[PDB]
C-alpha cells in the first residue's frame, strides 16, 4: 500500500480523510490495500520476563480505527522524552529502533473468541515503558475523540495486562482495574496458591505508576510536605482541588485527581504538560500516584482576576504592559505547537511578582475546576478565538474594573488613554476571524516601546497647518498657524481635546513665547509685529521689528529677527503698548536670519552659519563659524543656515536641508563630531533634520523630514532607537508638562489635503526602549534554557 509521493504528485485533504498519511522520505502510507497480513516479524525477545504485553479486547474494530491509529503511532519515539525500522500491515504497525527499544502493535484473534484484540508488545525496559505509555495514550485519546461510546458503560472494551510468574509458562491476564486496585494495595502481584511466586506490579504495567516520566519530573516523596485539608485549599474553592504544600523546600501548588476516573485525566494532563517548556506557562515540577498528584510552581501574588478588583492600585502602566506581553507570549508559544487554549480569562492568568521590571510576571494556567467567548464560540476551538479572548483580556487589563465586576474603554471607565493598546484591542476583537491578527502578530505589536510611551495623539482640523507652538508652564497649547496669509492664533486643550482659533495678525505667526510675571503670549509674525495677547483676558503691540520675527525666547524677552538683529525687552517692558526694547544689536546681516536661541547661565544662539554667545551684558562673546566643517562634512550641508542650536556640554547644530548634525566644543570652538542621520536611517530602511530637542537624562531627540525620530545616547553618540509610523514629516518638537508631574515630549507632525497631528510621548522613551529590549533578551534566554 506504500506509494511514493512522486507517483501521486490537496495532500492536506488526503491526510484529513485518511488517504495519504505521509510516512517519510517522500513516501505515503495509504492504508488501503496494504499487506493485509502479518509479514513475519521476529521480535528481539521471546521470554515472558523480557517483554510487556498489553491487550485490548473489543467487540469489533470500528471503521477507520486502524488507519487513524497507525497515523497516530507513526510519530512515536522513545527519545522524545535513531530511525526506526518501520513495518506496516493493514491492522498493525511495527516499530524497531533497537533490541532495547521497539513496539509491536497489531490485531490479534483468540481461539474460540469472536472478539477482536489489539496487542501491544514492548521490551521490559525504560524505553519500552515510554513506548508503551505513548501507545496507550494515543489509543485512549483516539477512542475518546473519534469513537466515543465504546468507552462508556465498558461497552465490551476490556484492557488486560499479560503476566507470568516463571519464564516458560503461558501468559495469564489481569484487568487493568483489578491491577490498579492491587497497585494501591501493594507493589506485588501474588500467586493465590503459592505466595512464594511474586512479580512486581510495575514492569508488567509500568504506565500505571508513571514509570515513563522524565527523570526530573518523578516525585520525591521524601521532599514533599503535603497535607490534604481545606485549610491549605488555594483560592478558598477556586482552581478546584489545588492545595498549598512544600516541595524541595519551596512552596508549591498541588492538584489532586482523587475521587474520579484518575490516571486517565492525570496521564492526559501529563502528556500535555511534559512537552510544554515555556516561560509564560506554569511549569510542572512533579507528579505522583500514591495520591494522584501534580506538583507545580506556586504563584505568590495569586491570579489576575483577584488583582483587577482587590489591588487596583498596583496596576501601573508598565505592569499592565508586561502582563499583556507575557500572556501574548504564552499564547504565541501555545499556538506555535498547534495547541489551543480554549478559555482564556483573567482567572487563568497567574501573577508571580508585582515588580514591573521583573523578568517573569504573568503565566497562563489551566486548572481543573461565558462573556469571554468569541461570537463563533458562543453561537457554536480556533486560534482566532484565542486572539479574541486575548483582546477581551487586554480590554479588561486596560480598563480599571468594568466587565469583570464593547463600549469605548476611555469614556466609560475614565481609563487614561493608551492609544496603541486600544487599536490592538480593536483589531483583536474583529468579528471576522480572518481579519484578526495572529498570536505572533499580537506579540510583535505588544513588543514595542512606542506602544508603551505613546500617551496622546490629537488630530487637528483638516487643512489647518501649524507653524509654531508653545505650552503653558502648568495641558494647554498655543499654536501659531500659517495655512493662510493672515496669521491665526489657536488654542488646544490637551486634557479635554478641544480646538479654538482666532485671527489676530495680518501676516503669518512665525513664533510664540510666554512672558510670566500675570501671563502674556508674544506672537512674532512675518511683518515683524510683536503682538502681546493676555493669556486670561482676550485680545498690546511692541515696537515693530525691521523684518520678520524668526524666534522668540523667554529674565528677559529675546526677539531674533530675520534681519540678523536681536532685540532685548524687559518683562515689565512688554506689558505696555508700543514699548521699545531694552537693547538692539546686530550679529548677522540682511541675508543671515537669527534663527535660533538656547540657554545653558550663558545664552547661545544660531545666526546664519555662526554660533554666537552672550552673557548678561548682552554683548557677543564667542563667534564660531561652522562653515569650516565642510572639510569633514559635505559642502552643501555645512554652508546652510543654522536652524536650531542645542547645548548641554557641547553645541549640537542642525542646519537647513542638512541631514548631518554637527557637534562643536564650547571651549575650543572646534568640531567635535558629526551625526549622519541618513546612515542611521539606512540601518532600518529622507534624513533631513527639521527639529532637534534635548533630554537632560542622557538622550538626544532628532526629528527628520521623513517623519522619523532618532533617539541617540549622547555617550559615543550611539543610536538608541528610530521611531516612525506616526506621521510623514516632523515639524515641531518640544518638552512640556501635562500636570501631575508628567514630563512629555510634544511632536507636531504632518500626515501629508494636509492632516497635522500632535503626538505626546513619555519622556522616558529611550529608557523604556532599552529596558524592553533587555527584558525581551532575558526572556528569550530563559526560553532557550527551558528548551
Ligand atoms: C496545580 C495546577 C495543575 C495544573 C495546572 C495547569 O494549568 N495545567 C495546564 C494544562 C493544559 C495546558 C494547555 N492546554 C492545552 C489544551 N487545552 C485544551 C487547553 C490548554 C496548560 C497551559 F498552561 F499550557 F496552557 C496548563 C495549573 C495548576 C496550578 C496552580 C496555581 C498556582 N499558584 C497559585 N496561587 N493562587 C492560586 C494558584 C494556582
Residue numbers in the entry: 1624 to 1632, 1649 to 1720, 1727 to 1798, 1805 to 2020, 2036 to 2046, 2050 to 2074, 2092 to 2160, 2165 to 2207, ...
Mind quoting what the paper says about this structure?
Mutations in leucine-rich repeat kinase 2 (LRRK2) are one of the most common drivers of the familial form of Parkinson’s disease (PD) (1–3) and are also associated with increased risk for the sporadic form of PD. LRRK2 is a large, 2527-residue multidomain protein. Its N-terminal half is composed of armadillo (ARM), ankyrin (ANK), and leucine-rich (LRR) repeat domains, while its C-terminal half contains two catalytic domains, a guanosine triphosphatase (GTPase) (Ras of complex or ROC) and a Ser/Thr kinase, as well as two architectural domains, a C-terminal of ROC (COR) between the GTPase and the kinase and a WD40 domain at the end. We present cryo-EM structures of LRRK2RCKW, WT, and carrying the PD-linked mutations G2019S and I2020T, bound to the LRRK2-specific type I inhibitor MLi-2 or the broad-spectrum type II inhibitor GZD-824.
As with MLi-2, the three structures—WT, G2019S, and I2020T—were very similar. Although all three structures assumed a DYG “out”, αC “out” conformation with a broken R-spine and a disordered activation loop, the WT cryo-EM map showed a closer distance between K1906 and E1920. In all three cases, the G-loop was folded over the inhibitor to interact with its pyrazolopyridine and Y2018 from the DYG motif. Here, however, the cryo-EM map for LRRK2RCKW(G2019S):GZD-824 could accommodate two rotamers for H1998, while WT showed density for a single rotamer. H1998 is parallel to F1890 in the WT structure, where it adopts the “up” rotamer (H). A potential role for H1998 in the GZD-824–bound structures is in the stabilization of F1890 in the G-loop, which is packed against the pyrazolopyridine ring of the inhibitor. In this case, the cryo-EM map of LRRK2RCKW(G2019S):GZD-824 showed density indicative of two rotamers for H1998, only one of which would contribute to inhibitor binding, while we only saw the latter in the cryo-EM map of the WT complex. The prediction, based on this structural difference, that LRRK2(WT) might bind more tightly than G2019S to GZD-824 was consistent with in vitro measurements of the IC50 values for GZD-824 for these two variants.
